[PDB]
RNA sequence: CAGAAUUCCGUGAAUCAUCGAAUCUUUGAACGCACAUUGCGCCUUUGGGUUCUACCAAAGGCAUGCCUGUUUGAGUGUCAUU
RNA sequence: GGACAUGGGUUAGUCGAUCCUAAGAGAUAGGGAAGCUCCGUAUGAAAGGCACGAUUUUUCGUGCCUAUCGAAAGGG
RNA sequence: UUGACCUCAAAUCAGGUAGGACUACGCGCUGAACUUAAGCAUAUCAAUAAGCGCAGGAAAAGAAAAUAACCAUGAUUCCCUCAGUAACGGCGAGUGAAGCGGGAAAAGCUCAAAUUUGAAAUCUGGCAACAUUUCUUUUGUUGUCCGAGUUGUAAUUUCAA
């Protein structure tokens, strides 16, 4: 019987946590993340998924190195020691 | 290996196929005695080396 | 409070043993923190942690400067000692090989350069 | 279950630590907009889904 | 000069000499890999014309590409829509097999810039092309004022962007009324932009 | 003269890496030393009872410390020879080590000398 | 841990035969003997030769793996290769 | 909130600004092989201890394609020497 | 009170994982494909070892013949 | 038997390089249907959305195998104009450029095809010196050995000659 009975037998995870995006979207049997496409080289990114794109694009994380480059550019990529 | 087979089977195609005369004329070369005589003359006129 | 310049005028062995002593003091202070410590000791924890950072920084500067001296005037130097501006800049043509010209172009510019001129009213 | 993986242990350990009430001294700071934890979680109501 | 004699011989493609050389060489190229390096150009005169120099940093790769048109990868040949889009077999690809040759050779040697390419041989199943490649990371290339231009990053994958000679042809890049619709997007975007100025 | 129908590729000389420079200017200091192994002892009531009964110290230990590195760190930090080490990862994700000291030493004096009682 | 495989440590680990030393150093026998004469490297027989040499008891010469390791970083071997190139 | 202080005859407070020296855990194009396994290996050097043929630890390494060169080869490919 | 708040709590050479292979997934070789990738798994691959010798014209001769992942109920 | 050369391999070989992300704008590839036609199949939507590959601060294009038919103009790009025009269309719905003219900006050139032949004059790399610096991080010059190269690297010439 579909419905309340069938829901009882749901105790086997089909997806687990991804090692690249940390989301519970890694299909265990396919060995592929439904979110980012891991273990492919490229990231899963579709132009019809504009909202999905902005949820995880650049700037949504720490941006640690790109902030460093921005500060270094604004002074001209200088090296050495100030007097 | 494949490169060895390719060398040897290439030699066989040149032996089997009908070679045009412009290419087949290169299969008849200078004789041994004349070749040695020619190279004896040439070695007297080798060009100067980089050091010289 | 350890002063970084006073650190700079010490030896590597002296810095190493001071680092070990500072680590021992930090360990004892953390023991106080778990056993119940006073505000003075908890305030000394941060100062000890910063002193260890200063010791480790001074050691690193000496090690990297020694590496720079050893690799000075060498064709190949360690990657961390090389420039790191941007990946694209590193791949770019250098000004020397950007200014390379053929003998044809050198003669043309030698004999017919852009003259400075002006017009009368 | 009793049979775990270390990654799950780590995920549960963080999630257990994040499920705690606010320190009281936080609320006394000037300009504080925090009054209670917006991210509380009960083991029956909302699941981790990890 | 031997290059004049080589050029005229390459023009006489139905001669018994060139037929024999085409047959023997096409057999050998088919026994080797689909993308295999050429130690030296097979048509040294043709390579020199296209920009090849016999010095360090110049590389030549031979490749064979399958002949014929393009069949849609649609499953079981089933299209969905109006019958004007229903054909699947007699379709054709908009880039020449020479352009496909450069793409695959360029992808194979991802550290080299595709200078140019030339047809060397063909049969019923394959066309054989030789792709000339330049090393932008070689000092012999970077110190050469004649070929420095390809070292600049604007020349990354000229073959992929259709900036080669056969690539410009495939895009219809030319001068005059016969090449009016090209570049397609730039021309189309100019004619379909609605210019609404201020005082109108 | 070949007596085998297979052609195996010949062995060639394989020179070992002799780099013209070091990829790293300076080798990193040992990133897991004795002080980073031992964070602080645990002083709960259960820990105290283990001190007084099993002659076992209880330490908050770094995650990547194994039983070997815990033993050397304890020996170097405290000059006491452990006879056994038992570790667990606590539900909060921190390693806890039960360091059973030798019969010649008592954990009580070691605890007082550390000062965490 | 696991059942450690027999022959992974002890005599079978510290003793190395002459042929295995040749493979280890990538030297010819003539080059290996020259290095052994120039340096101080002589055969060292084990107490349990059968255990050291897999299971066989055929006469083989044993060298310390430590000695063969030390010969890896000897500049004379490079000079032998450079002379062969010359 | 505690706490110190910097005297105020300064090399110096600060959740300050600025930033050219460093650090930068586990990852990820992710690179020794893997990975719902803190899983499985290998190479070089070094060190440790009541224990030294054992065990352990540390540091530096080992992905694929391609280019220039180097070294070592292969071939009833072309030939001389003989 | 399985609620709420503060603390405490899970110790292994021997129990599991780890190791093995199953159905099956799956890189490499190669071939397709505009491509994303597809097919492929000892295939049209130079796919790796082992022992002898006063040391061999002090430039090495002579013999001898298959990744990986996949089981906390299988094997151990 | 030694060697030479060609071809093909191997190395944790010496030194390099490619991937991935962003993708508003840029270069391609591939490619619809809703919709309009008061139905609908050509048409339209549309050389569009989605899919794929590849760049830069712009990209592309660019010094005529170009217009014109004049008293001729003179690389490309963009703007206004040509012009909703010529033309294309179940000549139906609908679609649709270019020359000239005005302006913004302007900049030209490089090879292959030639015997240096009284002299490969060319180039990479190692090593050793000096030198220079957004910079002990950068960039070189000189010397000298190995090599690449005559199946062609320099100088010389590019149709305007
Ligand atoms: Zn993911």
CSV table of C-alpha atoms (C1' of nucleotides) in Angstrom, one decimal, chain A residues 19-20 28 68 71 75 78-80 82, chain H residues 19-21 23 27-30 35-36:
chain,number,residue,atom,x,y,z
A,19,UNK,CA,33.7,15.6,-0.6
A,20,UNK,CA,33.9,18.7,-2.8
A,28,UNK,CA,26.4,6.6,-3.5
A,68,UNK,CA,44.8,39.5,-1.3
A,71,UNK,CA,44.9,44.7,-2.2
A,75,UNK,CA,49.3,49.2,-4.8
A,78,UNK,CA,55.1,45.7,-5.2
A,79,UNK,CA,57.6,43.6,-3.4
A,80,UNK,CA,60.3,44.2,-0.8
A,82,UNK,CA,59.0,49.7,3.1
H,19,C,C1',50.0,46.7,4.3
H,20,G,C1',55.6,45.4,0.0
H,21,A,C1',57.6,40.2,5.1
H,23,U,C1',51.9,31.9,8.3
H,27,U,C1',40.2,19.5,1.1
H,28,G,C1',38.9,21.0,-3.8
H,29,A,C1',41.2,21.7,-11.2
H,30,A,C1',43.6,18.3,-6.7
H,35,C,C1',37.5,7.3,-0.2
H,36,A,C1',29.4,6.3,3.1
